[PDB]
Amino acid sequence: EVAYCSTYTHCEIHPSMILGVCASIIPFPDHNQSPRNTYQSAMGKQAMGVYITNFHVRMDTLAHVLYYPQKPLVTTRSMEYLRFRELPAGINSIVAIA
């Protein structure tokens, strides 16, 4: 076309791979203000869930375990690769803003 450039040498796979591990579990992260995405990535590191499947054998100190974990109803496509639907931490609740 009347184009920006015409000598492209490479192309990206998907521009969503520029995010870390704790920041790629946020739905629609391109709609929030920036400092908000920093807080959650330092806050989903201290959410109770099930942390490992053989928690019966390990005599760790200070282990928390949730009864009924659930997987999200609104998921990012880059959560199938870090096993967030096999060891989830949270519950889908019905929230009202009032």
Partner: protein
């Protein structure tokens, strides 16, 4: 308020049961337009603005944080100053309880119907944004041609950067004007920004129209590679897309090369907060220790720990900062003809005085003549004070901090004694002169009868007496005020008590109170401007 088809009350009629005592206040509301108070309908409130809480009941006006929040002269402040603290406690309590219990009937929320705009608005916003981008491209091409002359004190680059910044500011202002005028009455963003509880007018613009433009180290996003910002763009490119102008909103989402820049800008703010806290925990702390040993002694002098004198009277007047208000002097500012037309108290007309006073009193004044001499002498005293004021304040302002608010204190006395301003009434003009003199004599900051001390006493209560005889002018209180004699004795008795009680207390640890007060702004302020 309504008694025929059905008995219906109003909100102002239930709210006027909360407001204690008989207090008087006049404020405004945040959407009071500037060109309303000039022309007609100034005492009519078509948008129901200009709060007037008269004799303890909300006559008119929409309340917001300008009238109930933390400002000076608010309704909680006036109720604190006039009634006490045991009644202001109950005032805060009763507002919060009855308004929560109505608020579960009305209800409140924020959805995303409160965060979207009609197509007519969106199309207009898109049109202007495209025009602004084209203008920047025209500026870029001419710079390559070499058709820009740098201003003195500026380089070729700095002038271009300034023009680009001005164009961006104009575009953001246009987007805000386009958005703000598409807001509805049932909206909830607008119902929070107006009421003053939370929000601001740039959040509505970033949520709805344009996020804005990021900047690290106080300037537009820098060439972090060689000649590029990210490896997607071309080298030696200076457009609005390449360097951080986020032209989408928070609801249309961000593109990747734009979410990265918004992360840079938000990162800089997070770093600033951490550094600022460390600075705050030291500078203010060091200041408190150095001036801690400063306090008010039993001589009303402010001495050190070694008793070596810092100030002869506290605050250079002798008063404590808890009980002072903003006032206006209104003698320094007007012309030499309006001053002589407002404070002269001329008896030459013989009809204006007759209209505003009792006939027997005016005729007696004219015949005594001694009275005429005294009143002309008072006008001359006022002219001398006008000159002294013109100096002390060489700039021209009139907002001066003083003790007890006098217009509110003559306006309470017009309703404790049911002053009809539609009748001539009576106030011997001399009684007013003699009363000013005696009250002026009784208030005493420096207790002394010696000549050396007498001079110090005269020097102190100086600006307050210029203000007192300025608002205590004979003419100005026999015309506009019209006050009955009984009213004057109460007006005078109270002025003295408020002043006597406003004197600073001998023993308060002033050097720490001041150090923490100085320590405050040391904290709110920017880390690097």
């Amino acid at each position: 308020a309504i008694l025929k088809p059905r008995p219906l009350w109003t909100g102002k009629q239930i709210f006027s049961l909360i407001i204690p005592g008989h207090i008087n206040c006049i404020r405004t509301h945040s959407t009071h337009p500037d060109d309303e108070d000039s022309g007609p309908y100034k005492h009519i409130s078509p948008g129901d603005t200009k709060v007037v809480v008269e004799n303890g009941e909300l006559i008119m006006g929409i309340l917001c944080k300008k009238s109930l929040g933390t400002s000076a002269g608010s309704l909680v402040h006036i109720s604190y100053l006039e009634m006490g603290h045991d009644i202001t406690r109950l005032f805060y309590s009763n507002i919060q309880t009855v308004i929560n219990n109505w608020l579960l009937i009305e209800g409140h929320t924020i959805g995303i119907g409160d965060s979207i705009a009609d197509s007519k608005t969106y199309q207009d916003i898109q049109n202007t944004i495209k025009k602004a981008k084209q203008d920047v491209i025209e500026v870029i091409e001419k710079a390559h041609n070499n058709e820009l002359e740098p201003t003195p004190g500026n380089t070729l680059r700095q002038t271009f950067e300034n023009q680009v910044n001005r164009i961006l500011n104009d575009a953001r202002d246009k987007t805000g004007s386009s958005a703000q005028k598409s807001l509805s009455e049932y909206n909830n963003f607008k119902s929070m920004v107006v009421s003053g509880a939370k929000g601001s007018k740039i959040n509505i613009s970033q949520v709805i129209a344009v996020v804005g433009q990021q900047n690290v180290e106080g300037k537009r996003i820098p060439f972090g590679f060689k000649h590029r910002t990210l490896p997607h763009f071309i080298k030696d490119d200076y457009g609005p897309e390449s360097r951080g102008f986020v032209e989408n909103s928070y609801l249309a989402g961000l593109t990747p090369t734009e979410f990265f820049f918004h992360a840079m800008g938000g990162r800089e703010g997070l770093i600033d907060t951490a550094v600022k806290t460390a600075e705050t925990g030291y500078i203010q702390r060091r200041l408190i220790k150095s001036m801690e040993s400063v306090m008010v002694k039993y001589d009303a002098t402010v001495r050190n720990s070694i008793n070596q004198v810092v100030q002869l009277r506290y605050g250079e007047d002798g008063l404590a900062g808890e009980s002072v208000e903003f006032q206006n002097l209104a003698t320094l500012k007007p012309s030499n003809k309006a001053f002589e037309k407002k404070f002269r108290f001329d008896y030459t007309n013989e009809r204006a005085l007759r209209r505003t006073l009792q006939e027997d009193l005016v005729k007696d004044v004219l015949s005594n003549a001694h009275i005429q001499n005294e009143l002309e002498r008072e006008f001359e005293r006022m002219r001398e004070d006008r000159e002294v004021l013109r100096v002390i304040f060489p700039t021209g302002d009139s907002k001066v901090v003083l003790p007890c608010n006098l217009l509110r204190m003559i306006w309470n006395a017009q309703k404790i004694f049911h002053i009809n301003p539609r009748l001539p009434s009576d106030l011997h003009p001399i009684k007013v002169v003699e009363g000013v003199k005696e009250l002026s004599k009784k208030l005493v900051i420096v207790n002394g009868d010696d000549p050396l001390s007498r001079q110090a006493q005269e020097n102190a209560t100086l600006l307050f007496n210029i203000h007192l005889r300025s608002t205590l002018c004979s003419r100005r209180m026999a015309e506009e005020f019209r006050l009955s004699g009984e009213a004057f004795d109460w007006l005078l008795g109270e002025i003295e008590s408020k002043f006597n009680q406003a004197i600073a207390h001998p023993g308060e640890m002033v050097g720490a109170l001041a150090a923490q007060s100085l320590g405050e702004p040391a904290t709110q302020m920017t880390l690097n401007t």
